[PDB]
Design a binder for this molecule. Structure first.
Ligand SMILES: [Mg+2]
Ligand SMILES: [Mg+2]
Ligand SMILES: [Mg+2]
Ligand SMILES: [Mg+2]
Lengths: 211, 211, 211, 211
């Protein structure tokens, strides 16, 4: 934009692959065969939930021309107490959570969302992903503080050994504590842009994980 | 057949292309050079709005174990009177609508959603896509119920010359009346499954139109 | 080169399509249903034959540090009198030639190779592609003359209505005479580089035609 | 199942990735930082040379209606004593060989080609890949005939630590002796079909290695 009307292509380009370590859920499960129960963790937004609907409504409602809504407690109170009714669960997360429950793993959610007075997100997640009481843990609302990775200390405190996420800070949080960081693709219709460069730390990336 | 742990791949598969007539917005615009203002139409769901958030919420709320919510007046009243605040506008639609408005074309929206006593979808569309009053037209609810007209009939009635849509029936509606049916890709995280085979009738398909 | 060790990617990029009019042999055949026999034409190199072996040997033998071999009659005499024994027929060409024979079309080959005193290329092609005597025509060695498209006059003289080729000059030769130019992908292991931008004239490009 | 004229596609399919451990030459080089000179090995056919031109010519000449040419001493004498002048060196091999030569590694070639009284393949490889005398080693012909040793046995004998190849048996040869087997993609225009499933054993596969 502007760009050629008819750009064309060639077969080198058509076949070209980025050097990324792609994995499947089955390969992950296999890599863990025989490992006793451990703590694992998931980012929420664009990892287990397509939550752009609420973030989109939030932006339009609270800061149509800026990102200020993300620092607005009135927004977080809406986002954490019912707007996830419009959040669409990701199939990759159904498969991963089922797999970790099968293993007897403890499941944590560690999100950059700000903490609120009350939250119904933990219930939404347990219900939608059919997580038994024993495997489920209340969502950790780690917040966002420029200059800090707010998730890293939580991964250490909960002894989380595998952390799934869509953002660079999810992968580097895992790296910070020596955990296995595994990338989920953010959907291209997410309102959180630009899309991250999945694989840019040499981490495993789950195939087809945009849905 | 087994789904092997390590299925591998090969370069025939990597380079394989489906025989699709892909087009860009710029190519479509070029094809209309010198053509006077005309009526054009858009399907709504998965064409201009990723509306799955409301449909997802509707299914959970009104028929968690069936598709009955789609025949439930209580759902439609919610879906057509505010749940599109959580619908995510598609960039392909922003570009198409901008291009057609610039041409002075009349913009119509023709949806298979069930009609309701009131609807705020028209306003949502005009506001989000910055459609001037002179180009905007209230949403048309098309279908097979008594007193309704089909998508085809509405295309005919409004002399719509190009119809954009994600579903097979959008393309056939256009074909049935000699209009130009152009396909938009349904996002893979849509809750309306299975995904259509874009290009199934040899129609033009807009590149990168999943977002 | 140099470039990031771990470049990563994202799902917009993974799904991204160039706006190209891809077609299959079956679609081409269907587009011609009911059309009586006509003359059609094929480029040779990287269209029907992977002839890089001979061109590679030629370069090494006659001009290791330049492109001068392509103006050397000693090279052309080798290339046109047996080095095509090492040229690998393309499956796309088997399918197209079979289809055109089925139609009763007259088949021509129009190549940028230079003419020689004798040539066994016509025999190689008739033999390998099982072309009956009635459909077969002796190869036209049109040569290469910077500033001219040497193929265009031949397409006009033989009333060729469809011309298949891998190079830009094949497509523009067709355009020059009002014929239907259809692009075949040059294989990425061809020694003729850079690869052309297939589709850069808005022409049809045959899927999977690199082999 | 029908192969429809207009099969269409969808964005799940467009974005679909096989779970492959893709790597680049730069990543492999990085993994060897600080490692002293070692022996490394390459398969020949479809790993470093696109040798299909000679194999194609051999099949046509010696067994047009079978695979018997591969057991024909007359073919092998031609194939190993000059027909590689028509073989096209692979760019991936240029990069790997350059990288390993720069490391001071010993370069071995281990092929399943039948042995002959004389062979000029070693010279072809040294000349085309600019392999210095100190790094070069004569081609090893491995197999199951009396007095031969298998690829595995030769890897063991030469203490080859990394083995590059296109076929399953190249990867298993490395695996059988605890060497690092790294896969190169076989070009889709190779006459050796079907193409292998690169990554079938969870091994590293070099990106873009079809040329
Ligand atoms: Mg996230
Ligand atoms: Mg729709
Ligand atoms: Mg050519
Ligand atoms: Mg090989």
């Amino acid at each position: 934009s502007p760009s050629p009307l008819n750009p064309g292509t060639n077969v080198a380009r058509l076949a070209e692959q980025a050097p990324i370590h792609w994995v499947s859920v089955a390969q992950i499960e296999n890599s863990l065969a025989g490992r006793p129960p451990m703590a694992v963790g998931f980012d929420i937004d664009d990892t287990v939930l397509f939550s752009s609907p609420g973030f989109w409504r939030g932006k339009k409602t609270f800061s149509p021309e800026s990102e200020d809504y993300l620092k607005n407690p009135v927004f977080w109170e809406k986002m954490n107490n019912g707007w996830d009714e419009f959040s669409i669960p990701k199939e990759v997360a159904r498969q991963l959570i089922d797999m970790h429950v099968r293993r007897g793993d403890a499941i944590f959610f560690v999100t950059g969302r700000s903490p609120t007075k009350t939250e119904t997100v933990s219930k939404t997640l347990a219900d939608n992903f059919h997580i038994p009481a024993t495997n489920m843990n209340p969502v950790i609302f780690a917040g966002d503080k420029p200059g800090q990775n707010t998730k890293s200390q939580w991964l250490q405190d909960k002894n989380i050994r595998i952390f799934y996420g869509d953002s660079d800070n999810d992968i580097t949080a895992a790296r910070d504590v020596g955990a296995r960081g595994i990338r989920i693709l953010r959907a291209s219709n997410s309102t959180y842009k630009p899309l991250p460069q999945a694989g840019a730390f040499g981490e495993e990336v789950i195939v087809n994980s945009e849905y």
